[PDB]
Amino acid sequence: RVKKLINSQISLLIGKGLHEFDSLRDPEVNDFRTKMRQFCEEAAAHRQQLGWVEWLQYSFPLQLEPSARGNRALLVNVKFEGSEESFTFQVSTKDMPLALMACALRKKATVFRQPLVEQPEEYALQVNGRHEYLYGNYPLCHFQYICSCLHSGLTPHLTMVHSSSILAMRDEQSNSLWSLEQPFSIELIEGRKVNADERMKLVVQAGLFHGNEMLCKTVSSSEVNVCSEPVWKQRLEFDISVCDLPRMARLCFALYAVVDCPIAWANLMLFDYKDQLKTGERCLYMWPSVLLNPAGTVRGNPNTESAAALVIYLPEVAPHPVYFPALEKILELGRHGERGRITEEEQLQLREILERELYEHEKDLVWKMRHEVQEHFPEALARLLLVTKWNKHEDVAQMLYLLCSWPELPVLSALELLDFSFPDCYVGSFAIKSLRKLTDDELFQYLLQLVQVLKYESYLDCELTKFLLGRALANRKIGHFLFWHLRSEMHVPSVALRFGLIMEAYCRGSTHHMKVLMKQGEALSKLKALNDFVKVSSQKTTKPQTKEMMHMCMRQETYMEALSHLQSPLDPSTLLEEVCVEQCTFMDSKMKPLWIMYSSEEAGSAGNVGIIFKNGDDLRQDMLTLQMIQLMDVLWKQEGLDLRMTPYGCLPTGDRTGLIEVVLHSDTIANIQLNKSNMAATAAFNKDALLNWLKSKNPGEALDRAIEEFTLSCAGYCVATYVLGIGDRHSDNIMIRESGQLFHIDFGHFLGNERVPFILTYDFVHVIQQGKTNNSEKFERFRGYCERAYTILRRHGLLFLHLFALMRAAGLPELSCSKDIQYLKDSLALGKTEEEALKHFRVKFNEALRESWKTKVN
Ligand SMILES: COc1ncc(-c2cc(NC(=O)CN3CCOCC3)c3cocc3c2)cc1NS(C)(=O)=O
């Protein structure tokens, strides 16, 4: 009776009725659902018997300063849970939270006149009106909240939570092949539901691929006239023996009418998930094209009513079922071989090509010397896997014998092995095995990417699915973001199945979070409906009248209930409590996004947050551009360079639907540039507007930090926008914070999509120099910041180049081919030495400085 209640709720949350999974009557889906439910059930169980501190590490994972993960006078306002009274203590930034708790329980004792039994080990420090906690043995300054407070000059507000209270929340949440030498062949029987120009003839181009690389030369079909139902019944004979086919082998098809014009495409794995070599008739429900597309999904098109079907016949090779040899048989064959016996002369050449694409003889050198490659250069695994001939059974057995006994690579090297260039499942398992060491902070930084690698998966049940699920159930934030990255792509038919199953499994592992995300979903349902009125009304009537019948609408009992008392999809630590209906408006852009305001009694001024709801644009590129800027900011802070960046939240939630974080107390450059009369910023020259503006937002001595806050953020934004190749930078998409902090918004076109140069703007160069015309001292400190930020970004170029490589799986039209990844392999300048790249960056900056001189002349 509780089950059907849970199952109706899962289906509603994922926006796909679980009956549809059963309807397919697919044994691969039916096994994932049983196998993965069990895993998640085991997880939930282990989680319900966690310690009170351990539970904190789940529900509220520590938010630490990049500098700290891996002295100064500070006033702090601590209170106790069931209390109205509070205390202000003058702690230090070097103090552990415990000394504060010890301080708080001493003050409580004296006030309440009682010799207190309580110890500070029994307590935790909640951030007031937040799902943020201050625990462990880390100085206060190490905590992101405490640190933000010092910069903003604000007083940290903490509530003392007893172990009993945490436990009370913990509780309230309890739920043989190698013999077959014949050349692999197929029968292209017929086609169905095809549409093409009568004047042409149809062709089927089939090819055998292992990731991207061809396993052999592709074979085309006979030219058969344009018919909705064309018939071939021909034998497509491929130049590859049945034994030689690898385990992760995929057969790709291309249907195209020629006089070139592609109709559709469809791929499939020759081996089933249970390692059986597929035999019988197969009807490939193709996907529309825009000649082979390996990377494309191996499971058929769901809408079978429009889709052009291709019926093929996998012939019976042996008299009984053939299963891919087990590792036992694989390691036996690859054990024996001739070891790499070569001259120190050719060993020198080997170190060169490994430390440094490569020539044919060079590959042969990497393959003959594979044992040395494992012994003295293990990080060079990927390059060795690329010299391997996956179209010969014995070379693969040789490779997998070296991998099985290969040392665990670092996290940076394991990210390369997730890419489609390495489709071997034992290589991927090893990749995840080398990735397991990932810190929960690190994992979260690369989760967007590892979730995109799920689209490169051949089979439903895989290491990556199990690893992400197990990690998501071990950290409520990872679980929050995992769900939303999955949920947002349910409209896409090529993933709706996989994703739905992943999310259904997750729900079995966290019944309570399933209720929390359903609460969030129900709010976004109302916002989609509200935005629809706004889109319509903004056309007919004026903004004051739309802004009013939108409030009236939000005032309704359904709206008031759904839009209030929830966690933010933008950050689950953020508790969007009571909605400020009067403070709610909508931007005047094409889509008419919504500005939703929130406020809290508990959180206080730190609880007055805002969100932006947008329906109409694809939000996946901005999300990527902002994760990159945030990573840039993490990589800089790690080297002690804090360029005071603002990577505000962005999160796609559904079909062309998402949320953007309101950065309160910020305004677009342009708005200030308007130089309106009767204001506190009204200038005699347009050059002054920003400076005069900062003056008013930063009186007296406060101006000097604001200018410096401006300089750093500007250094970082120039450097963030150069590397990423962010174009279309007008006055609108640049915003300034009252603190002086500068930031960018609306990331329409990155990776030069032609070739975006270094950008410098005299209106900000006038602010940097503190109003002065010639101020080489202050300006050249800004040039120094740019150089520092640029060189730190280059030293992590393989990290950006690996996260952009994997991100190709999303299908962002400004990130799909080789040239897009060349952009970073040109901006981060990884061919040139640090000195040769620094030479070229200064030459790029000076050119921008000269370009900025178009205004200094006028
Ligand atoms: C991806 O699109 C966007 N990317 C970013 C933002 C965005 C916008 C902000 N603020 C405003 O637009 C304030 N306005 C209100 C109306 O008068 C002018 C000033 C933000 C402040 O903190 C983070 C912000 C992020 C918006 C869009 N969508 S749009 C450009 O079509 O409205």
Short mmCIF file of all heavy atoms in Angstrom, two decimals, residues 89-137:
data_model
loop_
_atom_site.label_atom_id
_atom_site.label_comp_id
_atom_site.label_asym_id
_atom_site.label_seq_id
_atom_site.Cartn_x
_atom_site.Cartn_y
_atom_site.Cartn_z
N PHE A 89 30.46 36.74 20.52
CA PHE A 89 31.81 36.40 20.99
C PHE A 89 32.88 36.93 20.07
O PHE A 89 32.69 36.90 18.85
CB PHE A 89 31.96 34.87 21.07
CG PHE A 89 30.94 34.15 21.92
CD1 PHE A 89 30.13 33.16 21.36
CD2 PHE A 89 30.81 34.43 23.28
CE1 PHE A 89 29.18 32.50 22.15
CE2 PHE A 89 29.86 33.77 24.06
CZ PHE A 89 29.07 32.80 23.49
N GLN A 90 34.03 37.35 20.62
CA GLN A 90 35.13 37.87 19.83
C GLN A 90 36.26 36.83 19.63
O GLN A 90 37.39 36.99 20.09
CB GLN A 90 35.64 39.21 20.37
CG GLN A 90 36.25 40.11 19.29
CD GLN A 90 37.67 40.52 19.59
OE1 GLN A 90 38.59 39.70 19.69
NE2 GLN A 90 37.89 41.82 19.71
N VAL A 91 35.93 35.76 18.89
CA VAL A 91 36.81 34.66 18.51
C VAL A 91 37.89 35.11 17.48
O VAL A 91 37.92 36.26 17.05
CB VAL A 91 35.99 33.41 18.03
CG1 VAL A 91 34.86 33.07 18.99
CG2 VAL A 91 35.43 33.60 16.62
N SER A 92 38.77 34.19 17.10
CA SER A 92 39.80 34.41 16.09
C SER A 92 39.53 33.48 14.90
O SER A 92 38.83 32.47 15.04
CB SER A 92 41.19 34.14 16.68
OG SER A 92 42.21 34.20 15.69
N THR A 93 40.08 33.82 13.73
CA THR A 93 39.92 33.02 12.51
C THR A 93 40.69 31.67 12.55
O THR A 93 40.35 30.75 11.80
CB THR A 93 40.27 33.86 11.29
OG1 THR A 93 41.52 34.51 11.53
CG2 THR A 93 39.18 34.86 10.94
N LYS A 94 41.70 31.56 13.44
CA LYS A 94 42.52 30.37 13.63
C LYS A 94 41.87 29.32 14.55
O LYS A 94 42.37 28.20 14.67
CB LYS A 94 43.92 30.77 14.14
CG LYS A 94 43.98 31.34 15.57
CD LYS A 94 45.42 31.42 16.09
CE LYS A 94 45.51 31.88 17.52
NZ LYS A 94 45.01 33.27 17.71
N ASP A 95 40.77 29.69 15.22
CA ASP A 95 40.09 28.81 16.18
C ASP A 95 39.29 27.73 15.51
O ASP A 95 38.67 27.97 14.48
CB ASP A 95 39.21 29.61 17.17
CG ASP A 95 40.02 30.38 18.20
OD1 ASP A 95 40.67 29.72 19.05
OD2 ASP A 95 39.98 31.62 18.18
N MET A 96 39.29 26.52 16.10
CA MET A 96 38.50 25.37 15.64
C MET A 96 37.05 25.67 16.07
O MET A 96 36.87 26.46 17.01
CB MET A 96 38.98 24.07 16.34
CG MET A 96 40.49 23.87 16.37
SD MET A 96 41.22 23.24 14.83
CE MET A 96 42.33 24.60 14.43
N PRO A 97 36.00 25.08 15.44
CA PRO A 97 34.63 25.36 15.90
C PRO A 97 34.40 25.04 17.39
O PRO A 97 33.64 25.76 18.04
CB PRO A 97 33.75 24.49 14.99
CG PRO A 97 34.57 24.23 13.80
CD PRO A 97 35.98 24.13 14.31
N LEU A 98 35.07 23.97 17.91
CA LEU A 98 34.96 23.45 19.28
C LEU A 98 35.20 24.47 20.36
O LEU A 98 34.50 24.43 21.38
CB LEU A 98 35.86 22.24 19.52
CG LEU A 98 35.29 21.15 20.42
CD1 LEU A 98 34.79 19.96 19.59
CD2 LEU A 98 36.32 20.69 21.36
N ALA A 99 36.19 25.36 20.16
CA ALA A 99 36.55 26.42 21.13
C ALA A 99 35.41 27.42 21.28
O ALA A 99 35.23 28.01 22.34
CB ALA A 99 37.82 27.13 20.68
N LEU A 100 34.65 27.59 20.19
CA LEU A 100 33.48 28.45 20.10
C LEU A 100 32.35 27.75 20.85
O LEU A 100 31.64 28.38 21.62
CB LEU A 100 33.11 28.64 18.61
CG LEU A 100 32.45 29.93 18.17
CD1 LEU A 100 32.34 30.00 16.64
CD2 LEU A 100 31.08 30.09 18.80
N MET A 101 32.19 26.43 20.63
CA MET A 101 31.11 25.70 21.28
C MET A 101 31.36 25.71 22.80
O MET A 101 30.43 25.98 23.56
CB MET A 101 30.94 24.29 20.71
CG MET A 101 30.77 24.24 19.20
SD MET A 101 30.48 22.55 18.62
CE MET A 101 30.72 22.77 16.86
N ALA A 102 32.64 25.52 23.21
CA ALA A 102 33.09 25.57 24.60
C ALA A 102 32.79 26.94 25.19
O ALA A 102 32.32 27.00 26.32
CB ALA A 102 34.57 25.29 24.66
N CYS A 103 32.99 28.03 24.39
CA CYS A 103 32.70 29.44 24.72
C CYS A 103 31.18 29.63 24.95
O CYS A 103 30.76 30.17 25.98
CB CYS A 103 33.20 30.33 23.59
SG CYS A 103 34.10 31.81 24.13
N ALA A 104 30.36 29.14 23.99
CA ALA A 104 28.90 29.24 23.98
C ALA A 104 28.21 28.55 25.17
O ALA A 104 27.28 29.12 25.73
CB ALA A 104 28.35 28.73 22.67
N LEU A 105 28.67 27.34 25.55
CA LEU A 105 28.12 26.56 26.67
C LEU A 105 28.55 27.11 28.03
O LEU A 105 27.93 26.77 29.04
CB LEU A 105 28.52 25.07 26.58
CG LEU A 105 28.08 24.32 25.34
CD1 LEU A 105 29.09 23.28 24.98
CD2 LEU A 105 26.73 23.69 25.53
N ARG A 106 29.63 27.93 28.07
CA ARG A 106 30.10 28.60 29.30
C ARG A 106 29.18 29.80 29.53
O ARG A 106 28.71 30.00 30.66
CB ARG A 106 31.55 29.07 29.18
CG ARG A 106 32.58 27.96 29.32
CD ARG A 106 33.97 28.50 29.61
NE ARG A 106 34.43 29.47 28.61
CZ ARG A 106 35.20 29.16 27.57
NH1 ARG A 106 35.60 27.91 27.36
NH2 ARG A 106 35.59 30.11 26.72
N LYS A 107 28.92 30.58 28.45
CA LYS A 107 28.03 31.75 28.46
C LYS A 107 26.61 31.34 28.83
O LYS A 107 26.01 32.02 29.65
CB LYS A 107 28.06 32.51 27.13
CG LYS A 107 28.37 34.00 27.31
CD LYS A 107 27.25 34.81 28.01
CE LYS A 107 27.66 36.22 28.38
NZ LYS A 107 28.51 36.27 29.60
N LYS A 108 26.12 30.19 28.28
CA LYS A 108 24.79 29.62 28.57
C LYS A 108 24.69 29.27 30.07
O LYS A 108 23.73 29.69 30.73
CB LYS A 108 24.53 28.36 27.72
CG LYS A 108 23.12 27.80 27.86
CD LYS A 108 22.97 26.47 27.16
CE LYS A 108 21.89 25.59 27.77
NZ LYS A 108 20.52 26.16 27.57
N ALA A 109 25.71 28.56 30.60
CA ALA A 109 25.79 28.15 32.00
C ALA A 109 25.57 29.35 32.93
O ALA A 109 24.64 29.33 33.73
CB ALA A 109 27.13 27.50 32.29
N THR A 110 26.40 30.41 32.76
CA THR A 110 26.33 31.64 33.56
C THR A 110 24.96 32.29 33.46
O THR A 110 24.37 32.57 34.50
CB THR A 110 27.50 32.61 33.27
OG1 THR A 110 27.85 32.55 31.89
CG2 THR A 110 28.72 32.31 34.12
N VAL A 111 24.42 32.47 32.23
CA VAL A 111 23.10 33.09 32.01
C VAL A 111 22.02 32.30 32.75
O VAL A 111 21.43 32.83 33.70
CB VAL A 111 22.75 33.33 30.49
CG1 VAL A 111 21.31 33.81 30.31
CG2 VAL A 111 23.72 34.32 29.85
N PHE A 112 21.86 31.00 32.39
CA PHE A 112 20.87 30.08 32.96
C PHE A 112 21.15 29.61 34.40
O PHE A 112 20.33 28.87 34.95
CB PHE A 112 20.61 28.88 32.03
CG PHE A 112 19.68 29.26 30.90
CD1 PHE A 112 20.15 29.40 29.60
CD2 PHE A 112 18.33 29.52 31.15
CE1 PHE A 112 19.29 29.77 28.56
CE2 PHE A 112 17.48 29.91 30.11
CZ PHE A 112 17.96 30.03 28.82
N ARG A 113 22.24 30.08 35.04
CA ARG A 113 22.64 29.76 36.42
C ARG A 113 22.67 28.25 36.71
O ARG A 113 22.04 27.79 37.66
CB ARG A 113 21.81 30.51 37.49
CG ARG A 113 21.31 31.92 37.14
CD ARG A 113 22.39 32.97 36.98
NE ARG A 113 23.32 33.02 38.11
CZ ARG A 113 23.09 33.67 39.24
NH1 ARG A 113 21.95 34.34 39.41
NH2 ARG A 113 24.00 33.67 40.21
N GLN A 114 23.36 27.48 35.86
CA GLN A 114 23.44 26.03 36.03
C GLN A 114 24.81 25.45 35.68
O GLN A 114 25.33 25.75 34.61
CB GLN A 114 22.34 25.30 35.24
CG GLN A 114 21.11 24.92 36.08
CD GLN A 114 21.35 23.86 37.16
OE1 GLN A 114 20.98 24.03 38.33
NE2 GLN A 114 21.95 22.74 36.77
N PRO A 115 25.37 24.58 36.55
CA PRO A 115 26.64 23.92 36.22
C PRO A 115 26.36 22.87 35.13
O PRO A 115 25.91 21.75 35.41
CB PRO A 115 27.10 23.32 37.56
CG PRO A 115 26.14 23.89 38.60
CD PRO A 115 24.88 24.12 37.86
N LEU A 116 26.55 23.30 33.86
CA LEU A 116 26.23 22.56 32.65
C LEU A 116 27.01 21.28 32.44
O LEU A 116 28.24 21.29 32.33
CB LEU A 116 26.36 23.47 31.42
CG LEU A 116 25.05 23.87 30.71
CD1 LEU A 116 24.11 24.67 31.64
CD2 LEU A 116 25.33 24.66 29.44
N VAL A 117 26.25 20.16 32.34
CA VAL A 117 26.67 18.77 32.10
C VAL A 117 27.28 18.65 30.71
O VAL A 117 28.21 17.86 30.51
CB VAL A 117 25.44 17.81 32.28
CG1 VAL A 117 25.48 16.60 31.34
CG2 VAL A 117 25.31 17.37 33.74
N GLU A 118 26.75 19.46 29.76
CA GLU A 118 27.11 19.49 28.35
C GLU A 118 28.57 19.84 28.05
O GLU A 118 29.17 20.75 28.65
CB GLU A 118 26.17 20.41 27.58
CG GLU A 118 24.89 19.71 27.15
CD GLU A 118 23.59 20.45 27.40
OE1 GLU A 118 23.56 21.69 27.21
OE2 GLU A 118 22.59 19.77 27.72
N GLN A 119 29.11 19.06 27.08
CA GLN A 119 30.45 19.15 26.49
C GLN A 119 30.31 19.69 25.05
O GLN A 119 29.26 19.48 24.43
CB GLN A 119 31.11 17.76 26.43
CG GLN A 119 31.19 17.00 27.72
CD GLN A 119 31.21 15.53 27.40
OE1 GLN A 119 30.17 14.89 27.22
NE2 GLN A 119 32.41 14.98 27.25
N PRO A 120 31.35 20.34 24.46
CA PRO A 120 31.20 20.86 23.10
C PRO A 120 31.28 19.79 22.00
O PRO A 120 31.03 20.10 20.82
CB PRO A 120 32.30 21.92 23.00
CG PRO A 120 33.33 21.46 23.92
CD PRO A 120 32.66 20.70 25.03
N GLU A 121 31.58 18.54 22.38
CA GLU A 121 31.67 17.42 21.44
C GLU A 121 30.27 16.95 21.06
O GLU A 121 30.11 16.28 20.03
CB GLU A 121 32.46 16.26 22.07
CG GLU A 121 33.95 16.52 22.22
CD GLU A 121 34.37 17.60 23.20
OE1 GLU A 121 33.61 17.89 24.15
OE2 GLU A 121 35.48 18.14 23.01
N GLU A 122 29.27 17.29 21.89
CA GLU A 122 27.87 16.92 21.71
C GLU A 122 27.17 17.86 20.75
O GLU A 122 25.99 17.65 20.46
CB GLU A 122 27.12 16.97 23.05
CG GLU A 122 27.31 15.80 24.00
CD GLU A 122 26.67 16.09 25.35
OE1 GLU A 122 25.43 15.95 25.46
OE2 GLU A 122 27.40 16.53 26.27
N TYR A 123 27.86 18.89 20.28
CA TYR A 123 27.24 19.91 19.44
C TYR A 123 27.80 20.07 18.04
O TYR A 123 28.91 19.67 17.73
CB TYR A 123 27.27 21.27 20.17
CG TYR A 123 26.14 21.43 21.17
CD1 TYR A 123 26.29 21.02 22.49
CD2 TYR A 123 24.90 21.92 20.78
CE1 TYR A 123 25.24 21.11 23.40
CE2 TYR A 123 23.85 22.01 21.68
CZ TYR A 123 24.02 21.60 22.99
OH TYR A 123 22.98 21.69 23.88
N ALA A 124 27.00 20.73 17.21
CA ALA A 124 27.29 21.15 15.84
C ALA A 124 26.89 22.65 15.68
O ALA A 124 26.16 23.19 16.52
CB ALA A 124 26.55 20.26 14.83
N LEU A 125 27.41 23.34 14.64
CA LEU A 125 27.09 24.74 14.44
C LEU A 125 26.39 24.98 13.15
O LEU A 125 27.03 25.11 12.11
CB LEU A 125 28.31 25.67 14.59
CG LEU A 125 28.79 25.98 16.00
CD1 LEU A 125 30.18 26.57 15.97
CD2 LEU A 125 27.85 26.92 16.70
N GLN A 126 25.08 25.07 13.20
CA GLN A 126 24.29 25.35 12.00
C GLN A 126 24.53 26.78 11.53
O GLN A 126 24.69 27.64 12.37
CB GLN A 126 22.79 25.16 12.32
CG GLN A 126 21.91 25.33 11.09
CD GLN A 126 20.43 25.16 11.31
OE1 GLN A 126 19.94 24.95 12.43
NE2 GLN A 126 19.71 25.24 10.21
N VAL A 127 24.54 27.04 10.22
CA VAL A 127 24.57 28.43 9.73
C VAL A 127 23.07 28.77 9.80
O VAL A 127 22.24 27.98 9.32
CB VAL A 127 25.13 28.62 8.29
CG1 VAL A 127 24.84 30.02 7.77
CG2 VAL A 127 26.62 28.33 8.22
N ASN A 128 22.70 29.89 10.45
CA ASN A 128 21.30 30.25 10.66
C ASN A 128 20.52 30.25 9.36
O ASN A 128 20.98 30.79 8.35
CB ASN A 128 21.17 31.57 11.43
CG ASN A 128 21.74 31.47 12.84
OD1 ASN A 128 22.30 30.44 13.22
ND2 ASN A 128 21.66 32.55 13.62
N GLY A 129 19.38 29.54 9.41
CA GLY A 129 18.44 29.36 8.31
C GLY A 129 19.04 28.85 7.02
O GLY A 129 18.72 29.34 5.93
N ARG A 130 19.92 27.87 7.14
CA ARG A 130 20.64 27.27 6.02
C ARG A 130 20.82 25.80 6.32
O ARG A 130 20.77 25.41 7.49
CB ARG A 130 22.03 27.91 5.92
CG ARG A 130 22.16 29.10 5.00
CD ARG A 130 23.53 29.04 4.35
NE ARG A 130 23.47 28.38 3.04
CZ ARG A 130 24.18 28.74 1.98
NH1 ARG A 130 25.07 29.73 2.07
NH2 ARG A 130 24.03 28.11 0.83
N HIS A 131 21.12 24.98 5.28
CA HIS A 131 21.46 23.57 5.51
C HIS A 131 22.99 23.47 5.51
O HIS A 131 23.57 22.56 4.93
CB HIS A 131 20.82 22.61 4.46
CG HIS A 131 19.39 22.20 4.72
ND1 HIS A 131 18.66 22.71 5.80
CD2 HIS A 131 18.60 21.38 4.00
CE1 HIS A 131 17.46 22.16 5.70
NE2 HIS A 131 17.36 21.37 4.63
N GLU A 132 23.62 24.47 6.14
CA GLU A 132 25.07 24.55 6.26
C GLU A 132 25.46 24.34 7.73
O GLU A 132 24.75 24.79 8.63
CB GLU A 132 25.63 25.86 5.67
CG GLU A 132 26.96 25.68 4.95
CD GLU A 132 27.61 26.89 4.30
OE1 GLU A 132 26.86 27.75 3.77
OE2 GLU A 132 28.86 26.96 4.27
N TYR A 133 26.54 23.58 7.96
CA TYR A 133 27.04 23.25 9.28
C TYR A 133 28.54 23.44 9.38
O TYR A 133 29.26 23.29 8.39
CB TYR A 133 26.64 21.81 9.67
CG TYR A 133 25.26 21.73 10.30
CD1 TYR A 133 24.11 21.89 9.53
CD2 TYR A 133 25.11 21.49 11.66
CE1 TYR A 133 22.85 21.85 10.11
CE2 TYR A 133 23.84 21.41 12.25
CZ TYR A 133 22.71 21.59 11.46
OH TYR A 133 21.45 21.50 12.00
N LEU A 134 28.98 23.76 10.59
CA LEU A 134 30.37 24.02 10.94
C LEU A 134 30.84 22.99 11.97
O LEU A 134 30.58 23.12 13.17
CB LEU A 134 30.45 25.45 11.51
CG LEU A 134 30.85 26.57 10.55
CD1 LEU A 134 29.69 27.03 9.71
CD2 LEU A 134 31.41 27.74 11.34
N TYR A 135 31.51 21.93 11.46
CA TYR A 135 32.02 20.80 12.24
C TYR A 135 33.47 20.42 11.85
O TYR A 135 34.07 21.05 10.98
CB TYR A 135 31.05 19.58 12.18
CG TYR A 135 30.76 19.05 10.79
CD1 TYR A 135 31.35 17.87 10.34
CD2 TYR A 135 29.88 19.71 9.94
CE1 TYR A 135 31.10 17.39 9.05
CE2 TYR A 135 29.63 19.25 8.65
CZ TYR A 135 30.23 18.08 8.21
OH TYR A 135 29.95 17.61 6.94
N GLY A 136 34.03 19.43 12.54
CA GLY A 136 35.39 19.00 12.30
C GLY A 136 36.40 19.82 13.08
O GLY A 136 36.02 20.60 13.95
N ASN A 137 37.69 19.61 12.79
CA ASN A 137 38.79 20.32 13.44
C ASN A 137 39.56 21.13 12.39
O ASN A 137 40.70 20.81 12.04
CB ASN A 137 39.71 19.35 14.23
CG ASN A 137 38.98 18.31 15.06
OD1 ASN A 137 38.08 18.61 15.86
ND2 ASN A 137 39.37 17.04 14.89
#
